[PDB]
């Protein structure tokens, strides 16, 4: 059986876990959201062949800067996430996450993922957003950052409404798909 490793990174609270659960369980963790990350698997049919898709959540706290990279080995693709309603999370993508990923896994592809896009149109949100003359990160703004940082592409979604959620992982797979050629892989290595 063939496998694809996808590590998910990003600032704390951007909705990494919710999007993983929502995707794997088809239901948004409205109840007790496991405030303790995990490791999931999904079986995906590609060309009529079954593939195991490993999804790895991570801890975004600085105190894990030491540990976190321990999961990177073997990753076929990364999901650098930021909330389209959190500028901090967005700026922190170029300053921290991309650099980190590129450092250890330089050949490993990554996608830029905007999360919680349902809160962009939300009134209650943009109301406390102008409380620093800021506005929701735009797709183009994000698309631009993606272009610059050289991400495979930009994708956003809502773990809550599940909008584009499936697509986020479809792209992950497409990007992850390795080359048969003399093991010309992009898999991360110690």
Ligand X SMILES: Nc1nc2c(ncn2[C@@H]2O[C@H](COP(=O)(O)OP(N)(=O)O)[C@@H](O)[C@H]2O)c(=O)[nH]1
1 close to 43: Cβ distance less than 8 angstroms: no
DSSP sequence for 85-128: T-HHHHHHIIIIIHHHHHHH-SS--EEEEEE-GGGTS-HHHHHH
Give residues 89-128 in contact with ligand X (rule: CB under 6 A): 115-116, 118-119
The CB-nearest residue to Mg ion is 17
Beta strand ranges found along 38-76 (DSSP E): 39-46, 49-56
18 vs 111, which CB is nearer to ligand GDP? 18
Give the CA count within 13 Å in the CB-facing half-sphere of 26.
Answer: 1
Give the interface with ligand GDP as residue ranges (CB under 6 A).
Answer: 10, 12-18, 33, 115-116, 118-119, 158-160
Between CA 146 and CA 155 the distance in angstroms is 10
27 in contact with its own copies (CB under 8 A)? no
Residue 9's CB is within 10 A of a number of other CB atoms, namely: 28
Least distance to Mg ion from the beta carbon of 14, Å? 8
Least distance to its own copies from the beta carbon of 145, Å? 18
182 in contact with its own copies (CB under 8 A)? no
86 in contact with ligand X (CB under 6 A)? no
71 in contact with ligand X (CB under 6 A)? no
Site size for its own copies (CB under 8 A): 24
51 close to 39: Cβ distance less than 8 angstroms: no
168 in contact with ligand X (CB under 6 A)? no
Residue 160 near which of Mg ion, ligand GDP, its own copies, none (CB within 5-8 Å, type-dependent): ligand GDP
- What does the binding site for ligand X look like in residue numbers (CB under 6 A)? 12-19, 33, 115-116, 118-119, 158-160
């Amino acid at each position: 059986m063939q496998t694809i490793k996808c590590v998910v990174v990003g600032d704390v609270a951007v909705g990494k876990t919710c999007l993983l659960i929502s995707y794997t369980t088809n239901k948004f963790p409205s109840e007790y959201v496991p405030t303790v990350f995990d490791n999931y698997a999904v079986t995906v049919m590609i060309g009529g062949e079954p593939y195991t898709l490993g999804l790895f959540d991570t801890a975004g706290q600085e105190d894990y800067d030491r540990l976190r990279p321990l999961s990177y080995p073997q990753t076929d693709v990364f999901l650098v996430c930021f909330s389209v309603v959190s500028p901090s999370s967005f700026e922190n993508v170029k300053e921290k996450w991309v650099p980190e990923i590129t450092h250890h896994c330089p050949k490993t592809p990554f996608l830029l993922v905007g999360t919680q896009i349902d809160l962009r149109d939300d009134p209650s949100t943009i109301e406390k957003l102008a409380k620093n003359k800021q506005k929701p990160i735009t797709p183009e703004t994000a698309e631009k950052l993606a272009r610059d940082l050289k991400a495979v592409k930009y994708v956003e979604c809502s773990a809550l409404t599940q909008k584009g959620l499936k697509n986020v992982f479809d792209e992950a797979i497409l990007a992850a798909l390795e080359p048969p050629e003399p093991k010309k892989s992009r898999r991360c290595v110690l």
